[PDB]
Design a protein around this nucleic acid. Structure first.
Lengths: 570, 50, 141, 383, 59, 36, 133
RNA sequence: AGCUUUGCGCAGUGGCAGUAUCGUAGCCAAUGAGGUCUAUCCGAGGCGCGAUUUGCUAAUUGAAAACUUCCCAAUA
RNA sequence: AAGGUAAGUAU
RNA sequence: UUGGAAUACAGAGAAGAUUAGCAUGGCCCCUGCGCAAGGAUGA
């Protein structure tokens, strides 16, 4: 091998991992100050989501795939390789842009309020990407507009006569000193204000001063690993700005608010309106929770640092979904085994001919009032020496093709397929349609009814045509008044057919059985009379439950039987 | 044999089925399956498992 | 052996730089008899064949053309000014003077990458561009 | 960094000026530039160590070119070894400078090995007459005392024949399986490995056919890794030849272990890692009866050394004879023929006849066996 | 609150912010695409198999 | 071609020899010596 | 545009329309004056003449000593360039622009044959000698 | 008169179309390309080089994804 | 000392 | 619908991007059109 092998003393997986290095990671992380202590200087607090666990960090981004595919040049290769460095250096911005670290002349960006010590090209370029298009002015305008709207909404109890804003200079958003006041509020006659303090305080003596005006200032600041003390910063900034000749405030009484973007921490300091202090605290919390520009900045940070939001858990359960199936706008289910089903011959001496039957997946959609018959050629469905995994891979392409042909609105909003193993390739196929979603189906539709039914069994042979076919819904569903219970009536007969096809036909009423219409593959149902026939079909499952399971036939509850009919149990 | 001039990349004027066939034939479909995402929590492997 | 084109007259270099179209004009100021400048000229000669399509190298002598010595502060050997598109580009490579490369490149491939990055930046229209390899350190260790 | 560049520029400029003095630039202008081309050609003709003859050029011009190239080669070798000494001493060097020094050292070593092989061919094998015969007699007497059945040709039926192929496929895959990407040659090797894994019987039949029929191999490339104190060789062989040699080495190792063909005292043993080997060595030293009281009336000597002439000081006739005495003659002949192949480089190719390709998959077995030969010779039959 | 009064997504809110800030909105083609998307969403909220079933009824 | 013609190359080599007297001229005066 | 004359009457710096690359102050320069410069240069030369002769003599001696150890580059082929002009005119004109001792291996072959014969003869004593087929 | 064999170009469907293919102003040519099976021999080009049309339309990111008037005081 | 000039656009 | 207001500008890509589908072309099976042409049968 042209590369040096440090582990030439012994081979891995041959002499075993002699050195146990597991406690070292825990000892190092806890001795550094714990997980929270380490993350305190890593811009983690800059993301509102509490992704302490379950967060995904993208080691390789889409640009990496593009560079790998495009066969980039030397300079392009170096630029692509210099991506992770920029990534974690932005991720380590607080502890790497301190004041004690990298002493020298302070410098701020072109149009923002981030001070950087020492020119760091990676941090500089990352910051100007994150704060592109006057993002600081945009977030300042967003916060001032939110404050104005909140004050106007509750102007009754606050005795607010006028709530306006001055002709703020455009550069006064990121300025070091708030020379121009942000929000002015004039009351009717008088306004009692207490001594300046922080929002954590509780005591108040409004007789300290009486003024007819009030000012509110928003301080957009970027906290470092050592200057992230919002309360101390709020106090110092209020003292400096309020007591200064350069700063011009129309009113001597007011409160200055501060937002640490990197810390994402809200604070305020100064006087308060009578009874507005909890109101202002709640308003600041609510705005900082779902501010538009703040949310955009958080999304920009998440993308730039390649920290993907922790993936949500799909409702793999379907017991509630089965009851709410009619509530879903679009839903469909497809049986993976049906597409890969291969009829097998029988011979005493000759080898069994497990030839493929057809490419149809026996797809169904009770909420859509119809079914999908993705009929394909048997040879196309399963080629020579084709493994089950190969058939599943080809079925995924056809599964996405059916969604591609269908309109986005008509396409199933939730693809509830009980085949969890086949769900992931379907979910991977579902990535071609981001609008649509795929949810696990705890309830399993008895697709074996189509194989058991001769009419659909003949359709399975009739599905040998490579072209797609149209599978009409059962006439029993149309006959039933309730479309929500139409599937349940069909599933109850279908589930008994899967357990016992021959017994199901006897259990099913001949009047309901001989009610087949040209508009439906399966016959109709005589409303309540079918339920009596389906009771025997239910009794067939109950007889199976009574004989096999310890619980008697009568002991099998209808609620459990309905779940068993829909296959809710694993 | 002078090296080609690195002109700025020009995207396909119109994505064709034959162009899509080449994209189907050659692309990053298999690489996209392998997710490079890493959990924030520590993995069970050692520090330098490689 | 310093067979690259050389500007006998100062004004000739001016019009040669002016007579450019979709190409980068690397004017290497200095003297051929200098040893470090000889190494730089050898590196430029090696690069010239590979990147002649868009990169043209046109040497000049400070003694022959001293009028441009004070124009861009030409007071060091091996100086290189990527005067492209009739615009003196800002090539930043971790150095104080981000408009002048005044030392022979260690490897030819590095110079080729630098010149193609300069071409890309000039074609994009930006007057400044950074280098993939910072030269604040010589990687001596 | 200009001194070497300064001298190279001085050489080329002086030669060009001398040519322009001799060549009448007042009459002919273009061809002089083309003259420089031959210069470079001559230079690379010296670097590749390939013949360079240009009958079109005048004889005095050829003499001037020869003088230029001899001066350049002397200076180039001098600066190459000087920079190598600077790097190995501890002086700080740059990446490009280190790569250039490594390339120059590779070229110099390739040349040196070329005249070494030529000198071995002209002067003949250095194994003294009847001396290699005496060594072989001692070896065969020791083997007869051991009285072991020699390894035969690969039988049609084997206990775990497919297992050896699986292990060899895994070993070859481990070279670049974890790598993000593989070269075109590496891609072809991976495809060949996958094909061999898919059809074990066809691959085994092909390997046996190559063993019993094929005796001429392709050009194995030779690169050098710089450990900053020396250059260690790495050899890229043909993927089919590589897999056949891997299976051959695995089969030889299994058959030798199954018949105790190698004594335990050989230091590299799979049972104990090197540190365990050292500690067992110390415990065995302490286990001697007169290990430490000997200082009362005797002495103890501990000698550790290395055979400096192992790679490029062997005669393949003795290897042939010993291997035929230790294994089936066809397999031994194939192994020795693989040890006598053509070595390629960036622009230099030669033939190895005295040396042994360390990159051969079975080179470990032959090196261990020959070291056993020296061990038996030095230690003595009774000992 | 937008013109229709529906609760906008934060992306749409920031889009409105920037459009107000620069003093101008999107282009004509972008507006046509946006209104087409809005019409599609409205049509989807208000909700074709009946026609298919009626056609399949005939042999 | 990119490279200068033969006359320009000869002139450049003559200038280099005249300026750098270390390896050219009657005597080696200095690197930048006008007269060797 | 190499090989073209420069039209006089125009300043190359101003006509091209360039901007002063002020890299750093105190790094560039940025008749009575002529007479003063001459006087100051004369004073500097007078000051420097205190040690010029001995230093020049020592430098010349050192250079002469260095030349004997290793001469100039063109010195190693002065004879060659002296004999270079002996080539005919038609010789370099047709320069292509495109780019006794017996078989010493016989002794090695004889030695190898002798060694092989000796080994084959010694193989007789190998009772357990084996072959393949 | 019907019918059939076959190829080019065009028309239609189907099919493959990154071990898929043409381009060549290069090069060996039915006067014999090029063979390692057949060397009184097979008979087609050999193997380099240059690379993998045009048109419709969606969708995504971004503040803006480019088709020839704003705003202000009051009003008609 | 420094290794810390964003470029662009007409005035 | 009047009238006018309309250092500075803008700012890390805007020297308008990214991704994707269908048809055609080319290739080739079948068939058709145009068309060279021979072969035999029947009244």
């Amino acid at each position: 091998v042209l590369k040096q092998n440090p582990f030439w003393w012994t081979h891995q997986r041959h002499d075993g991992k002699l050195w146990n290095l597991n406690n070292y990671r825990t000892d190092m992380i806890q001795a550094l100050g714990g997980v929270e202590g380490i993350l305190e200087h890593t811009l983690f607090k800059g993301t509102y989501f509490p992704t302490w666990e379950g967060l995904f960090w993208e080691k390789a981004s889409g640009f990496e795939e593009s560079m790998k595919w495009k066969k980039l040049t030397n300079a392009q290769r170096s630029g692509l390789n210099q991506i992770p460095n920029r990534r974690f250096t932005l991720w380590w911005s607080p502890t790497i842009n301190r004041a004690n670290v990298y002493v020298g002349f302070q410098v701020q960006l072109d149009l923002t309020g981030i001070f950087m010590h020492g020119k760091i090209p990676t941090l500089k370029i990352s910051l100007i990407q994150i704060f592109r298009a006057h993002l600081w002015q945009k977030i300042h305008e967003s916060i001032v507009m939110d404050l104005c709207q909140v004050f106007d909404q509750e102007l009754d109890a606050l005795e607010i006569e006028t709530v306006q804003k001055e002709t703020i200079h455009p550069r006064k958003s990121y300025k070091m000193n708030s020379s121009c006041a942000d929000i002015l509020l004039f009351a009717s006659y008088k306004w009692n204000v207490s001594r300046p303090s922080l929002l954590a305080d509780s005591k108040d003596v409004m007789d300290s001063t009486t003024t007819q005006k009030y000012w509110i200032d928003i301080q957009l600041r970027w906290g470092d690993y050592d200057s992230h003390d919002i309360e101390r910063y709020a106090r110092a900034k209020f003292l400096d700005y309020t007591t200064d000749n350069m700063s011009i405030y129309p009113s001597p009484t007011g409160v200055l608010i501060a937002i640490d973007l990197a810390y994402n921490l809200h604070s305020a300091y100064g006087n308060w309106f009578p009874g507005s202090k909890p109101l202002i605290q709640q308003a600041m919390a609510k705005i900082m929770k779902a501010n538009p520009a703040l949310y955009v900045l958080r999304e920009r940070i998440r993308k730039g640092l390649q920290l993907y939001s922790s993936e949500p858990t799909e409702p793999y359960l379907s017991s509630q979904n089965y009851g709410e199936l009619f509530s879903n706008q679009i839903i469909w289910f497809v049986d993976d085994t049906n597409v890969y089903r291969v009829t097998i011959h029988k011979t005493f001496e000759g080898n069994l001919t497990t030839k493929p039957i057809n490419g149809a997946i026996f797809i169904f959609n009770p909420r859509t009032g119809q079914l999908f018959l993705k009929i394909i050629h048997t040879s196309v469905w399963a080629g020579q020496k084709r493994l089950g995994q190969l058939a599943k891979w080809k079925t995924a392409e056809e599964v996405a093709a059916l969604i591609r042909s269908l309109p986005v609105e008509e396409q199933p909003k939730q693809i509830i397929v009980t085949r969890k193993g086949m769900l992931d390739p379907l979910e991977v196929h579902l990535l071609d349609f981001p609008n649509i979603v795929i949810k696990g189906s705890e309830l399993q539709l008895p697709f074996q009814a189509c194989l058991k039914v001769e009419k659909f069994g003949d359709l399975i042979l009739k599905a040998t045509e490579p072209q797609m076919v149209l599978f009409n819904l059962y006439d029993d569903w149309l006959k039933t008044i309730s479309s929500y219970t139409a599937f349940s009536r069909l599933i109850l007969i279908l589930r008994a057919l899967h357990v016992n096809n021959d017994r199901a036909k006897v259990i099913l009423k001949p009047d309901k059985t001989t009610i087949t219409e040209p508009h439906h593959i399966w016959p109709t149902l005589t409303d309540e009379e079918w339920i009596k026939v389906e009771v025997q079909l239910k009794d067939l499952i109950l007889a199976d439950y009574g004989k096999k399971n310890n619980v008697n036939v009568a002991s099998l509850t209808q609620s459990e039987i309905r779940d068993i009919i829909l296959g809710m149990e694993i | 044999k002078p090296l080609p001039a690195p002109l700025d990349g020009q995207r396909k004027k119109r994505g064709g089925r034959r162009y899509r066939k080449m994209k189907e034939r050659l692309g990053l479909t298999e690489i996209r399956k392998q997710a490079n995402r890493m959990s924030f929590g520590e993995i069970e492997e050692d520090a330098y498992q490689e | 052996s310093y067979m690259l084109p050389h500007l006998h007259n100062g004004w000739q270099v001016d019009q040669a730089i002016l007579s450019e179209e979709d190409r980068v004009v690397v004017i290497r100021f200095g003297h051929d008899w200098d040893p470090t400048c000889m190494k730089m000229d050898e590196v430029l000669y090696s690069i010239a064949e590979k990147v002649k399509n868009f990169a043209v190298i046109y040497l000049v002598d400070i003694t022959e053309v001293p009028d441009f010595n004070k124009m861009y502060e030409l007071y060091d050997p091996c100086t290189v000014m990527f005067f492209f598109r009739n615009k003196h580009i800002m090539i930043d490579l971790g150095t104080g003077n981000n408009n002048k490369i005044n030392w022979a490149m260690e490897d030819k491939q590095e110079m080729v990458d630098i010149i193609e990055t300069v071409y890309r930046g000039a074609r994009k229209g930006r007057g400044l561009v950074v280098s993939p390899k910072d030269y604040s350190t010589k990687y001596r260790y | 960094q200009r001194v070497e560049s300064h001298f190279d520029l001085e050489l080329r400029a002086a030669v060009m000026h001398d040519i322009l003095d001799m060549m009448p630039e007042g009459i002919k202008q273009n061809k002089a530039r083309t003259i420089l081309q031959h210069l470079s050609e001559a230079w690379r003709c010296w670097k590749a160590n390939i013949p360079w003859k240009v009958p079109g050029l005048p004889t005095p011009i050829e003499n001037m070119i020869l003088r230029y190239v001899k001066a350049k080669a002397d200076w180039w070798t001098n600066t190459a070894h000087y920079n190598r000494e600077r790097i190995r001493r501890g002086a700080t060097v740059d990446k490009t400078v280190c790569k250039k020094n490594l390339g120059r050292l590779t070229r110099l070593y390739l040349k040196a090995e070329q005249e070494r092989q030529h000198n071995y061919l002209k002067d003949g094998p250095y194994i003294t007459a009847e001396e290699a015969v005496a060594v072989y007699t001692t070896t065969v007497h020791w083997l007869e005392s051991r009285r072991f059945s020699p390894i035969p040709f690969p039988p049609l039926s084997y206990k775990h024949d497919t297992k050896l192929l699986i292990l060899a496929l895994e070993r070859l895959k481990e070279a670049y399986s974890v790598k993000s990407r593989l070269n075109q040659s590496q891609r072809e090797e991976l495809g060949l490995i996958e094909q061999a894994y898919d059809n074990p019987h066809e691959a085994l039949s092909r390997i046996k056919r190559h063993l019993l029929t094929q005796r001429a191999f392709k050009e194995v490339g030779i690169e050098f890794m710089d450990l900053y104190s020396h250059l260690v060789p790495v050899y890229d062989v043909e993927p089919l030849e590589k897999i056949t040699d891997a299976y051959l080495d695995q089969y030889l190792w299994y058959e030798a272990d199954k018949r105790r063909l190698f004594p335990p005292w050989i230091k590299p043993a799979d049972t104990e890692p090197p540190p365990l080997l050292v500690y067992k060595w110390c415990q065995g030293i302490n286990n001697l009866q007169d290990v430490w009281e000997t200082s009362e009336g005797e002495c103890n000597v501990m000698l550790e050394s290395r055979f400096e002439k192992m790679y490029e000081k062997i005669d393949l006739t003795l290897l042939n004879r010993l291997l035929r005495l230790i294994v089936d003659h066809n397999i031994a002949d194939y192994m020795t023929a693989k040890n006598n192949v053509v070595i390629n480089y960036k622009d230099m190719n030669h033939t190895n006849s005295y040396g042994i390709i360390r990159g051969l998959q079975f080179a470990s077995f032959i090196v261990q066996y020959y070291g056993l030969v020296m061990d038996l010779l030095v230690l003595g039959l009774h000992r | 609150v937008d013109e229709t009064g529906r609760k906008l997504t934060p992306k749409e809110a920031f889009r409105q912010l920037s459009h107000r800030f620069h003093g101008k909105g999107s282009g004509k083609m972008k507006t046509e695409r946006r209104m087409k998307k809005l019409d599609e969403e409205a049509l989807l909220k208000k909700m074709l198999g009946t026609v298919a079933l009626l056609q399949e009824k005939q042999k | 071609e990119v490279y200068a013609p033969g006359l320009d190359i000869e002139s450049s080599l003559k200038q280099l020899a005249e300026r750098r007297t270390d390896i050219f001229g009657v005597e080696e005066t200095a690197i930048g010596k006008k007269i060797g | 545009f190499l090989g073209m004359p420069a039209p006089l009457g125009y300043v190359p710096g101003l006509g091209r329309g360039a901007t002063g690359f002020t890299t750093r102050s105190d790094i560039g320069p940025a008749k009575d004056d002529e007479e003063a410069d001459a006087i100051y240069a004369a004073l500097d030369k007078r000051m420097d003449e205190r040690r010029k002769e001995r230093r020049e003599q020592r430098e010349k001696e050192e250079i002469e000593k260095y030349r004997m150890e290793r001469p100039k580059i063109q010195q190693q082929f002065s004879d060659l360039k002296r004999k270079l002009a002996e080539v005919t005119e038609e010789e370099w004109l047709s320069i292509p622009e495109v780019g006794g001792e017996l078989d010493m291996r016989k002794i090695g072959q004889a030695r190898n044959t002798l060694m092989d014969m000796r080994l084959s003869q010694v193989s007789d004593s190998v009772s357990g000698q084996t072959v393949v087929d």
